[PDB]
Ligand binder design. Structure first.
Ligand SMILES: *c1c(C)c(C)cc2c1nc1c(=O)[nH]c(=O)nc-1n2C[C@H](O)[C@H](O)[C@H](O)COP(=O)(O)O
Ligand SMILES: Nc1ncnc2c1ncn2[C@@H]1O[C@H](COP(=O)(O)O)[C@@H](O)[C@H]1O
Ligand code: SF4
Lengths: 608, 233, 189
């Protein structure tokens, strides 16, 4: 049964001329779709439609070739080809009876424009603190009118296109915010200086947009009320509130975030440094001045936490991004009170990793059909059930084999899942024990929960943990019709790496002063005052271990033969990871590989 | 030599069951499985059987056509035969009536050891084994967390797991009825090729008349309490 | 009439739940002439007199057997031996691992009313009503004891609130039936 305290969550709300069936709102977010993958775009939002989110939005959407995000992919609404391709999605969000927003974007010099080659315009001449090679032209007053018409244009075409919601996207430090914010805005004419100068651009733009489709589409804006940079950028209690105040009559809805573009990690909080609701303290402050509907993300997956922020009059609606990728059905699960069936977004940001690399499609660590709904036609909550009696052995019940069984059993098969470990999760179990990653558990947690549930529903099907490792004889004699081996990988023992592809002579971690991240992680094997992490890995392993050991008070040097933490640049984790390794006085020697290990001693070399 | 293990098929409700009459829960909310404790039983016995060179393990169950399901799972988990004692008039026998019905199977079977679980997962009576022990007139101990028994001893040595975790050793005259407690061993799991070969085994069906009972002996009419109400609290 | 309580001890110490049961028993007496008898069993069960000499106890019966601590054969015999000879309406025991070991046998032999892990009780008229859990404790399960002149109950510990203060029980002694336990305690661990 639906706990009735959550009823609150299924109460409509008025947003201008538009009505949200319920409180569950998918804010704009990229997916690797844009206008370019109209299949994938439609399907992936329409399942969330069918899943019962109220309104679904395209990712940030370009109003003109002089804001082109290539190599990244954004969406576009430049021409009638675009209005075609985006309509596919609106019809499709429509047939399930929620709303379609589209997020009107121009980002000035943050748009490198590598496809369109055109020149980007801004309040003042600068060069992006993100695409550092990409400079804007200073708009004169005629540049102010032509770009504003841009949005108008783009707002018209948004209605032809069938959007129920349009935004003036003013977050992550794109055009309207660049005007507002003195960091960017060095103008001394009437568009600059005074708070009502700064916000004229946006204030204007909003109005123009209203005038344009105001009576058929709710105009929302997203706004980045604090930059979390402090003095010198927007502060919520300085410019933030006030701006809310100056806009409020224009907006049908606020859609709130904090951060800039260069480290939007602060909007999209890593679970490695942020919990749920993180944003709230700065979210809150917006209701205290707005008289309009306000939503504001914050990795809200828990309906308890959801009801808190509404019944405490901190939001009106629930803004989600990631959590809607994890579980397109999270609402109808909450509506249906099916609390245990909910797939909890772990905050791993791999999903932002792909888009942030420039080109590939989003993928997701809980939701393996994410990206897969058009092109493979996998639905996250419907499965082809088998038309035989066939059975499957699965060896190992880690991410891989556990999904293996989850899906199969959901498919109706007869499955025996076995692993030598005592619990479901393969190496996730240590991974989640690394400092910060405690919310990455969730990924076995959900599996353990559903296999358990699946077993009562298949009677032959079987879970067996604590077993004797299987042998190939056990396996051939097991009697499964089919077998999935899912037995894992281990850290390399022997200094084998991506540079040499051969072992480092004198590397071997049966020796007393030599560790793997299993041995560090098991916590048994004993660890010397002075530590050196020899790193060939661009992802989290290295830094993290570094954190661990430092916090346990060893003296720490990472020897890195690759760019450390490179992946992390892309999950939005990197800033706070570095600051963190600084804070714990962790020594980094880059561009440095190693040619032989000896007791107490290693030979290292610059790679240039 | 022969160890007889008394097993039960329990019920587990779904969310959100509903009461039925007000005397039970509705039957559609129910799901039947081998009581959890019995998995620890069956093993201890397979433990013994494999510790030697010749021991029949035999599981016995009282109840309806469903139970089969469980006794087969016992076959696969190790048992040598599986017996089901039934008659419709057995409806609602309570934990002491079960003792008695078991006992009469237990005599025909004449084992050297009788194992019961410590309590059921469903009604948690924590009576059925000791009841079989009174009626049999055997030496009993309840709550067994360790067994040393070799086949055809006159004598075994157990350990009761007391409240809070402190153990107590007991020396007990055999043949004895013992209720086995959780954590006693690590009950095996059935290969598919195992579960497959236990399909092909017979469940022996035993009738009240086969065991010198009658309708007038069993079912709630004879029981030791009587159901007044069941209510979700 | 009378309610019987069987107290429980281990390594020289009286267990809390013994006062709870005395509390329960008194709690459930149907009029203030009805007497509570308490019984402690052990080859040194008299050491206990002081602490069971408290409020609600109208009698304290000390039964010396073979064993120092809990033995089932001895207990079983000891209790039916107390019941036979005080004729009570109810007997309380703790639901304790000690009790699993013989509560049930007692009931098997006699047909008294029996129910365990009881955590509600209650007279309704002269009808005794005890409540149990069903389905791994998902419902509550009310039962009664038709025409039973003796009912045996095991009571869920840390439910029934004790009585405060001292008390003046008639103490008596009686020997446990000289019968050889078919078991033997050796050591704790
Ligand atoms: C892309 C990617 C995949 C992520 C996950 C977020 C995102 C992406 N693209 C966005 C864009 O087109 N415009 C925009 O305004 N926001 C975009 N987002 C961020 C998202 O909307 C959320 O602000 C954050 O993810 C934080 O909230 P939450 O997911 O914790 O609920
Ligand atoms: N009807 C039955 N048939 C066989 N064994 C039973 C039956 N009912 C209870 N048991 C046994 O009693 C053990 C303890 O359960 P209980 O006293 O019901 O809590 C269960 O494992 C079985 O060993
Ligand atoms: S990749 Fe991770 S953080 Fe992203 S939606 Fe998925 S589970 Fe959530």
């Amino acid at each position: 049964a639906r706990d009735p305290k959550h009823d609150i969550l299924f109460e409509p709300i008025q947003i201008g001329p538009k009505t949200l069936r319920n409180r569950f709102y998918q804010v704009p977010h990229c997916i690797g779709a844009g206008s370019d993958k109209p299949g994938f775009q439609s399907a992936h939002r329409s399942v969330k439609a069918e899943g019962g989110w109220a309104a679904l939005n395209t990712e940030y959407c370009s109003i003109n070739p002089e804001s082109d995000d290539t190599h990244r992919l954004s969406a576009r609404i430049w021409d009638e080809g675009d209005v075609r391709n985006l309509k596919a999605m609106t019809d499709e969000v429509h047939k399930y009876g929620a709303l379609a927003g589209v997020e009107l974007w121009y980002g000035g010099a943050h748009a490198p424009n590598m496809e369109s080659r055109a020149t980007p315009r801004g309040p003042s001449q600068y060069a992006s603190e993100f695409e550092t090679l990409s400079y804007c032209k200073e708009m004169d007053l005629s540049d102010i009118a032509q770009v504003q018409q841009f949005y108008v244009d783009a707002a018209k075409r948004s209605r032809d296109a069938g959007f129920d919601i349009v935004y003036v996207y003013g977050a992550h430090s794109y055009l309207p915010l660049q005007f507002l914010n003195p960091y960017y805005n060095k103008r001394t004419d009437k568009y600059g200086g005074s708070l009502e100068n700064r916000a004229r651009f946006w204030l204007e733009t909003l109005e123009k947009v209203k005038h344009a489709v105001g009576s058929d589409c709710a105009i929302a804006t997203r706004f980045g009320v604090d930059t979390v940079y402090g003095p010198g950028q927007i502060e919520a209690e300085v410019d933030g509130q006030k701006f809310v105040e100056m806009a409020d009559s224009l907006v049908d809805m606020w859609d709130i975030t904090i951060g800039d573009i260069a480290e939007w990690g602060e909007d999209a909080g890593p679970s490695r440094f942020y919990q749920q609701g993180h944003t709230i303290p700065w979210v809150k402050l917006v209701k205290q001045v707005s008289k309009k509907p306000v939503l504001g993300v914050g990795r809200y997956t828990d309906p308890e936490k959801m009801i808190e922020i509404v019944t405490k009059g901190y939001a009106d609606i629930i803004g989600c991004a990631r959590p809607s990728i994890a579980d397109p059905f999270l609402p109808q699960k909450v509506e249906q009170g099916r609390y245990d069936d909910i797939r909890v977004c772990i905050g791993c940001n791999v999903c932002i990793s792909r888009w942030e690399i420039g080109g590939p499609p989003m993928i997701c660590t809980q939701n393996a059909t994410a990206g897969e709904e058009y092109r493979r036609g996998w639905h996250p909550e419907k499965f082809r059930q088998t038309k035989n009696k066939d059975s499957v052995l699965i060896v190992g019940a880690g991410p891989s084999g556990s999904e293996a069984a989850r899906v199969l059993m959901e498919s109706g098969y007869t499955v025996h899942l076995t692993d030598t470990a005592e619990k479901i999760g393969g190496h996730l179990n240590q991974v989640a024990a690394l400092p910060g990653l405690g919310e990455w558990s969730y990924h076995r947690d959900y599996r353990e929960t559903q296999i358990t549930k699946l077993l009562k529903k298949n009677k032959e099907s079987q879970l067996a943990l604590g077993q004797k490792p299987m042998t190939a004889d056990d396996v051939l004699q097991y009697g499964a019709d089919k077998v999935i081996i899912a037995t894992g990988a281990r850290w390399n023992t022997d200094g084998t790496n991506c540079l040499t592809h051969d072992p480092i002579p004198g590397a071997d971690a049966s020796l007393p002063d030599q560790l793997t991240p299993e041995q560090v992680m098991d916590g048994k094997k004993k660890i010397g005052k002075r530590v050196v992490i020899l790193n060939a890995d661009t992802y989290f392993m290295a830094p993290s271990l570094a954190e661990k050991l430092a916090t346990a008070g060893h003296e720490v040097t990472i020897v890195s033969g690759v760019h450390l933490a490179n992946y992390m640049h892309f999950t939005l984790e990197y800033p706070n990871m570095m600051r963190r390794l600084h804070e714990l006085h962790v020594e980094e020697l880059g561009d440095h590989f190693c040619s032989r290990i000896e007791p107490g001693r290693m030979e290292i070399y610059n790679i240039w | 030599m022969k160890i007889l293990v008394a097993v039960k098929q329990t019920a587990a409700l779904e969310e959100d069951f509903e009461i039925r009459d007000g005397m039970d829960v509705d039957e559609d909310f129910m799901m039947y499985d081998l009581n959890e404790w019995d998995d620890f039983s069956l093993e201890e016995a397979m433990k013994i059987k494999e510790s030697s060179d010749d021991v029949e393990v035999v599981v016995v169950s009282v109840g309806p056509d469903r139970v089969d399901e469980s006794l087969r799972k016992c076959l696969a988990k190790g048992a040598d035969r599986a017996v089901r004692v039934w008659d419709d008039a057995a409806e609602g026998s309570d934990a002491i009536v079960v003792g008695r019905i078991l006992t009469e199977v237990i005599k025909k079977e004449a084992p050297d050891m009788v194992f019961a679980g410590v309590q059921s997962s469903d009604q948690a009576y924590a009576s059925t084994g000791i009841s079989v022990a009174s009626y049999l007139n055997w030496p009993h101990a309840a709550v067994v967390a360790d067994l040393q028994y070799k086949p055809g001893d006159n004598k075994a040595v157990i350990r009761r797991e007391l409240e809070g975790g402190m153990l107590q050793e007991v020396e007990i005259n055999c043949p004895a009825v013992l209720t086995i407690q959780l954590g006693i061993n690590k009950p095996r799991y059935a290969s598919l090729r195992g579960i497959k070969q236990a399909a092909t085994k017979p469940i022996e069906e035993v009738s009240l008349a086969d065991i010198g009972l009658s309708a007038n002996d069993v079912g709630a009419a004879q029981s030791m309490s009587r159901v007044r109400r069941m209510y979700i609290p | 009439s009378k309610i019987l309580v069987i107290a429980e001890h281990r390594r020289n110490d009286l267990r809390p739940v013994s006062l709870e049961l005395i509390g329960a028993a008194n709690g459930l007496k149907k009029s203030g002439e009805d007497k509570v008898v308490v019984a402690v069993i052990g080859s040194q069960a008299d050491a206990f007199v002081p602490a069971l000499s408290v409020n609600g106890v109208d009698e304290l019966v000390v039964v010396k057997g073979s064993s120092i601590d809990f033995d089932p054969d001895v207990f079983e015999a000891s209790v039916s031996a107390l019941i036979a000879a005080h004729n009570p309406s109810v007997v309380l025991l703790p639901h304790s691992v000690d009790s699993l070991g013989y509560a049930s046998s007692l009931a098997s032999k006699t047909g008294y009313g029996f129910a365990t892990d009881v955590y509600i009780v209650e007279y309704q008229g002269d009808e005794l009503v005890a409540t149990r859990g069903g389905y791994n404790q998902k419902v509550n399960v009310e039962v009664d004891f038709p025409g039973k002149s003796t009912v045996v109950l095991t009571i869920r510990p840390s439910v029934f609130k004790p009585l405060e203060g001292a008390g003046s029980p008639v103490v008596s002694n009686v020997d446990a039936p000289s019968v050889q336990s078919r078991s033997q305690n050796k050591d704790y661990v």
